[PDB]
């Protein structure tokens, strides 16, 4: 054995046997301009990355049978509903009496600095005109959005669409990224090392973000995010987004980090020899039977490692010849 990071043998393991589902995958997001110095814009970027579903900002949902929106069942929602129904905005004839009243919270809403407007646009985009949505102003003591279906039964479909929107509907952020942690790095390995006009090295203390997920293709393609230093520990994403030489270097950096965390040191020529052997064939040659017995090393060299009988079976059925080189 800020955030929890896997180190030691489990991390060394996941590196040698390239795993598609690591235990603690994370990104290292670096900012470009003013956002790297101030915390307000950095928070804006954090909210622009951290995945936000309707459940994170919803306080409580409730399904009612409102036969006529003019005289609603609820007493506190009668003021803005007539202010919206006095004029024909949608097809009132294609309306259903089953109402889905959602109540949000000012706290989680103001932290992510969202607006009901954006939620309404996300709903009208994800479900089109088939699901009409309305909402009050940002002045009432309670945030509520009233939903209806346009035309399984309606009530059951609503309770099904209630959860559809409550989970998959991404209000803001990038999916697969659960949480993001912002902090100032005290260590110089994460600071911004620049060269002053006098020619001296200066380590600037700038804000950086650490995510709990891994989506490089989408995070790198964002404003105020540095497309040069932003990296990750998931070598699969590095190989899929940047390539084989990049994963070669990223793998060496991860191995060096695992070995140096305890203050130890290993010669770079060894880490390089390992990283090169795992990348000399264009693909991530995992240190396992699934990566070592799939190359042309000869049937005897493979049988000695693993799948001793099966390898010899394939070699016999194919008439393979071991050149006696290893």
């Amino acid at each position: 054995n800020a955030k929890n990071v896997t180190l030691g043998v489990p991390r060394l393991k996941e590196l040698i046997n390239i795993s598609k589902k690591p235990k603690t995958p994370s990104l290292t997001v670096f900012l470009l301009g003013q956002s790297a110095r101030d915390a307000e814009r950095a928070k804006d970027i954090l909210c622009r990355l951290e995945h936000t579903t309707l459940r994170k900002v919803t306080a409580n949902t409730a399904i009612y049978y409102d036969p006529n929106p003019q005289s609603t069942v609820v007493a506190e929602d009668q003021e803005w509903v007539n202010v919206y129904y006095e004029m024909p905005d949608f097809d009132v004839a294609r309306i259903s009496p089953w109402l889905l009243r959602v109540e949000l919270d000012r706290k989680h809403m103001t932290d992510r600095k969202l607006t009901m407007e954006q939620i309404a646009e996300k709903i009208n985009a994800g479900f089109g005109d088939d699901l009409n949505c309305i909402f009050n102003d940002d002045n009432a003591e309670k945030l509520v959005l009233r939903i209806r279906i346009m035309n399984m039964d309606d009530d059951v479909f609503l309770r099904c669409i209630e959860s559809n929107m409550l989970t998959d509907m991404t209000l803001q952020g990038i999916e697969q990224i659960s949480k993001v942690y912002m902090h100032l790095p005290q260590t110089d390995n994460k600071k911004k090392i620049i060269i002053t006009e006098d020619g001296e090295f200066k380590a600037l203390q700038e804000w950086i973000l650490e995510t709990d997920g891994v989506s490089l293709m989408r995070v790198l393609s964002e404003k105020d995010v540095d497309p040069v230093r932003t990296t990750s520990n998931d070598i699969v994403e590095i190989f899929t987004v940047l390539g084989i030489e990049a994963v070669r270097k990223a793998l060496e950096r991860e191995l060096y980090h695992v070995i140096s965390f305890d203050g130890s040191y290993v010669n770079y020529r060894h880490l390089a020899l390992l990283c090169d052997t795992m990348t000399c064939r264009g693909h991530l040659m995992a240190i396992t039977r699934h990566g070592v017995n799939r190359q042309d090393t000869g049937p005897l060299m493979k049988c000695s490692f693993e799948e001793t009988v099966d390898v010899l079976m394939e070699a016999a059925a194919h008439g393979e010849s071991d050149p006696m080189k290893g």
Partner: protein, 117 residues
């Protein structure tokens, strides 16, 4: 709003499922087995509390004051009877991050008044 309780039929006592009367445009509760129907009185069929705004004062019970493993204090007396001694414990309930809150209960029998500071 509050959660919504289940209504049982009078014939087979089974539960009814939300249904609507298209002619009069009114909410009805009918049994899916027999031909019984009932006029709803709440108009609400489903309520989901994402915030989990549960008042733990209803889940605690006065008999907990008989626990010798619980700590006792004389600094927070009871407001219903004036008893000095009272037991205090934490929430210990999942889905509640602010679990460090203390819940007090009066050790006096025939009272056991509960509260929070």
């Amino acid at each position: 709003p509050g959660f919504v309780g289940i209504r049982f039929c009078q014939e087979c006592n089974n539960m009814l499922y939300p249904k609507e009367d298209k002619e009069n445009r009114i909410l009805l509760y009918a049994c899916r087995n027999c031909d019984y129907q009932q006029e709803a009185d709440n108009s609400c069929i489903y309520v989901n509390k994402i915030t989990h705004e549960v008042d733990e004062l209803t889940q605690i019970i006065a008999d907990v004051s008989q626990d010798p493993t619980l700590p006792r204090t004389e600094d927070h007396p009871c407001q219903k009877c004036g008893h000095k001694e009272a037991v205090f414990f934490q929430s210990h309930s999942a889905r509640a991050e602010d679990a460090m809150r203390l819940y007090y209960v009066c050790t006096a029998p025939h009272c056991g008044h509960r509260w929070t500071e």
